[PDB]
Amino acid sequence: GSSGSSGPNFSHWGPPRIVEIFREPNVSLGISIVGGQTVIKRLKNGEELKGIFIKQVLEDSPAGKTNALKTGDKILEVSGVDLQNASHSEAVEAIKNAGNPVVFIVQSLSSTPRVIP
Known about the structure:
By secondary structure, the protein is mainly β. It has a single domain, classed as PDZ domain (Pdz3 Domain, Roll), CATH 2.30.42.10. It is 8% helix and 21% strand. The chain has a 5-stranded antiparallel sheet with strand order 1-5-4-3-2. It is found in: Cell junction, Tight junction; Apical cell membrane; Cytoplasm, Perinuclear region. Residues 18-110 form the PDZ domain. This is InaD-like protein.
């Protein structure tokens, strides 16, 4: 264990996923994000996450149709912009200032998507 590992099948985050989302006029991408911090106490030590995570995704949106993005996910990059350590606003501007199309690089935790009605 030259490095060590801690996590007996707990919140196992698989590999990243790239998805191209085309922004809409009247309506936005239809994606949201929670929290959003860029600076936190150093001494702090834990296993939690601070990165940007999908807050909520609409249905009548370009992101809700791709069925490749859902609330809870962890956005690591968008349109080729590192939003991991990016605050709530730092990430927002990225999605709004993402050179269309708007690519999304997140990682869906050990879970399963949903089917259409």
